[PDB]
Amino acid sequence: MVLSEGEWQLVLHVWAKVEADVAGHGQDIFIRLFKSHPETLEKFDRFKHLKTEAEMKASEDLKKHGVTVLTALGAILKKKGHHEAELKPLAQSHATKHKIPIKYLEFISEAIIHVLHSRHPGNFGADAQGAMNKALELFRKDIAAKYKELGYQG
Ligand code: HEM
């Protein structure tokens, strides 16, 4: 699949807002993910002990992790589709070291959309959300293709 320049512009416009506070967006996204799909928390040995949202918000390590994840996702989005190089190491670590099913990538994509919708309604209308969903589906499609090449079905 391919996004038009117009769709990329909608994606990058709202992402520019996210970049005004990466750490804050990272926390909301992971808390949303862990609360909506608790099973995903079991994949993080470093955070699986967190019991409440209060504990999650207070975790310095979780906040730092969120910045690392969003920064990588941002680098990929800014390539506007030409992200083959950025995807390689990401796909290998998540398929071989962390063992993350495509299903879980769908869950975090939902968390991202939810948080952007909550925080940036003025820059995340129907068209912009459609553009973001398309960019995330492209991301998941390409990561899935790499998973297969690497020998991981998940
Ligand atoms: C938006 C998609 C995602 C991106 C861009 C992303 C990015 C990253 C990055 C950059 C790291 C650190 C470097 C590395 O280990 O490769 C990381 C670590 C990790 N990711 Fe992801 N990730 C994504 C989705 C997920 C999902 C959905 C899970 C599973 C619920 C997951 C589980 C992990 C784990 C377990 C680690 C190691 C954390 C640690 O022990 O420090 N990731 N991810």
| Domains by residue range for the chain, with CATH | 1-154 (1.10.490.10)
Q: Is 103 in the pocket of ligand 1 (CB under 6 A)?
A: no
Atom 11 in ligand 1: which residue has the minimum CA distance? 69
Atom 2 in ligand 1: which residue has the minimum CA distance? 105
* Annotated binding residues: 65, 94
Q: Is 4 in the pocket of ligand 1 (CB under 6 A)?
A: no
Q: Is 47 in the pocket of ligand 1 (CB under 6 A)?
A: no
Reported structure resolution in angstroms: 2.0
3-state SS, the chain, equals CCCCHHHHHHHHHHHHHHHHHHHHHHHHHHHHHHHHCHHHHHHCCCCCCCCCHHHHHHCHHHHHHHHHHHHHHHHHHCCCCCCHHHHHHHHHHHHHHCCCCHHHHHHHHHHHHHHHHHHCHHHCCHHHHHHHHHHHHHHHHHHHHHHHHHCCCC
Technique that determined the structure: X-ray
